[PDB]
Amino acid sequence: SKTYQDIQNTIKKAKQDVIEVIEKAHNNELEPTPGNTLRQTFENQVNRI
Amino acid sequence: PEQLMNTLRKLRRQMDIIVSEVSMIRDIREREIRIYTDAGRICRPLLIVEKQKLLLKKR
């Protein structure tokens, strides 16, 4: 019931993190992480998160 | 194409000219209205929504 709170917190942070990656790519600020297109760097960031 | 879709669906609910088994598909991006009445199309029942409320009232 503490672990539940930690998980939920982590998850929300995660969901939160991905929204900014979506904002950056949606406003063209996600610069292509060398060796990648735009659409790849995005997917990488997301999957990392 | 905004007058057709609203008209075709009203008939497809009111059981008269267009039978319940017909599907009418409106493609927005490309200017296409596709209707199928043919056989073998897999489909399933859904509740209708209007405004953001169901047609399935307590009556």
């Binding site: 949606h26 406003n27 292509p32 735009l38 995005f42 | 194409p1 905004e2 927005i28 200017r31």
Partner: protein, 116 residues
Amino acid sequence: GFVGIRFCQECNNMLYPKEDKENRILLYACRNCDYQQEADNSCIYVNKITHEVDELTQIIADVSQDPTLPRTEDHPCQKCGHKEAVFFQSHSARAEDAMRLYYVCTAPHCGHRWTE
């Protein structure tokens, strides 16, 4: 820019580009016909290797009536000034490297579209 197809006036066929030897001018003759019409473009064939396309030319205004398409109230129109707008990605093949969004004003008789 471009070049278009310019059609014959006699046969209604496709005109080829043809250089006038001994006035030093650019013509448009036919195959089927004996129709000579005088060029203006001074340009024959063009090719965009970059294939630079503006998407706002392909966007139709009819998108706004899409139930399945997210709606904002944070970007207002510029011609009329409406508050509602739908937004979607390029929705195109051949998208080079872009996740850029595109907006359309959600107010009838306007259909103004823009990119931020």
